[PDB]
Amino acid sequence: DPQVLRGSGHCKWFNVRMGFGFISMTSREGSPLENPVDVFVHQSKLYMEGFRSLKEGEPVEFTFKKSSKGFESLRVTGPGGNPCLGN
Amino acid sequence: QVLRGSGHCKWFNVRMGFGFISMTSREGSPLENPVDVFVHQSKLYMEGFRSLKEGEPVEFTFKKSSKGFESLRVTGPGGNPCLGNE
Amino acid sequence: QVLRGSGHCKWFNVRMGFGFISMTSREGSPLENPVDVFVHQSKLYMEGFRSLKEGEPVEFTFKKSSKGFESLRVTGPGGNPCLGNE
């Protein structure tokens, strides 16, 4: 298979009761995007210990794929591959 | 004032209980460019299991949020129950 | 006999389904220091999804419980519906 796509951006929203949200992707494959793209993010894909969440606006890096949703994340970290911080 | 629009389901993930509506009319006027409106299963007017099916026509109230726009209450045309994809 | 108080929502977490009220009046007399009263979503008087918004004013019945106080029924001022923040 082709290698998975990668990008970076920030959390648009994340609802912890729902257990999901969206990332605004502002860079893709190492190049800035003129127009940001929303990417779905589920709690199960967040790299961090304990309860998993993202804070609005928090910077993230991720791998993702195309789907019927548009685009969805496969694994999500903070900058530098650090754990996400969450709320 | 509560914001009102109409359109059709863009897509809906039945397992996760949410999707998006493509809004094609807002506040009584047609939109040339459709606008995505988030929709959660809990906001759907219908009996039994709540979901939407891609393409089904909807009328709804909504509000601005960090999601962009999100639904408050969603029905089919004329206030009919939504159909869904159970 | 149920105890009566009023105050405001201290906090409420909708994933948890509960929070605390800061009681600032008890049996009609004002308190200088607020008193914590537990509040479960199942006790909130309102339609739809039940929650409280931080700071919203509430009236309630409550009882003594092993570790403090727990509300039995919670309304807004005048017995109106709570407002919420889902």
Add this chain to the structure above:
Amino acid sequence: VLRGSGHCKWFNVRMGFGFISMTSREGSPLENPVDVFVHQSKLYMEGFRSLKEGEPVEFTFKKSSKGFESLRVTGPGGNPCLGN
């Protein structure tokens, strides 16, 4: 980050939360304990997460609308909590 230590005051497994009696704040012993809210999601341990009344804990916390709210709770030395 704020840190303290103490012991479980009480814990409610129906609702998934309790209180810690904080007896030291940032390494300074307190004459009287301070209440710290603790949700089950904060407890470092495998399986069903709870605290046993009186068990010793070490924790990070913050000021919030809850009062003092624990963020990550362990036993002594960073080891898992015991629970019931």
Add this chain to the structure above:
Amino acid sequence: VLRGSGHCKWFNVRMGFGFISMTSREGSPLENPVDVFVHQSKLYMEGFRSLKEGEPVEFTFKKSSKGFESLRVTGPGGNPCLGN
């Protein structure tokens, strides 16, 4: 169908079950109570289902590998259980 009456012996809301002390079996008073298992799913009431220690109950039951196992539990007169 077997029927009896009694009161809640104890109830565990973490695990969702308890025991009824059956003090009458098919309308006949018992010198000593008989244990009857009760799962939360059997309790006739709205909302969160539990029994309060000592609350009076009326119930159908059967013999099973549990011993005596309640099938539908109400309060006096077929009214809802009270719970905690």
Add this chain to the structure above:
Amino acid sequence: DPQVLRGSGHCKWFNVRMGFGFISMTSREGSPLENPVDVFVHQSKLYMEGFRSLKEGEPVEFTFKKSSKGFESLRVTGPGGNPCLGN
């Protein structure tokens, strides 16, 4: 829309941890079937009070529809429209 299809039969299996099972349909639209047809049944569709379940072999009547699953039930009762009995 056309009226919903109806049939009768018996529970093939029902797993209460899963919350679902299958019905073996042996009559459809009031006529016996030479070859029985399996019809999915979810707990939410069982007409009865309290915890919802079917016992293996229990006789049922139901409305159903075609789906990607094959066929799935819309509402399930016992004989005569009586509540299901369950376990």
Add this chain to the structure above:
Amino acid sequence: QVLRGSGHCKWFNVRMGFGFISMTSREGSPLENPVDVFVHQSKLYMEGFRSLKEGEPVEFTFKKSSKGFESLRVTGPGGNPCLGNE
């Protein structure tokens, strides 16, 4: 002896966590007429969220039950993780 077969996913309901495998080989021999084998998500060898995608090739162990036949452990070809439809 544990029963072994191979085939492909017939269909799989991701929300409900189950489906059927169309078994086209059993105990080393080809089947002319495929045989339905129930499969639950809990029996799928793969990391992360467990499901199957319609048509994906599978190898599995199974047993007779009131379901007809049901899977005990399911992999892709050669023992590979299943692919799924998350």
Add this chain to the structure above:
Amino acid sequence: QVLRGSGHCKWFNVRMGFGFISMTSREGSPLENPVDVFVHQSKLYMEGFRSLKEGEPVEFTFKKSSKGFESLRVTGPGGNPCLGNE
């Protein structure tokens, strides 16, 4: 100090995730009348989905609890895995 016993599964419900053991030996001495010991799925020594089958023989550590006895660790004879019945 943990108490030791052996016996057999009285019943086990996999939706509940628990059951009871009938203890028929305590600290190596036989009992005429079996004694109930609660058993949670989380205490069962086996791979995969944890359960007990009615009548299967077990060995265990246990403790006194407020309403009876509760098992701490449960195995089959000789410390082998429990068998189960999912």
Add this chain to the structure above:
RNA sequence: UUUUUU
């Protein structure tokens, strides 16, 4: 089918 997460 003790998810205000059907």
Add this chain to the structure above:
RNA sequence: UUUUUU
């Protein structure tokens, strides 16, 4: 993301 029901 207190579902051995991810």
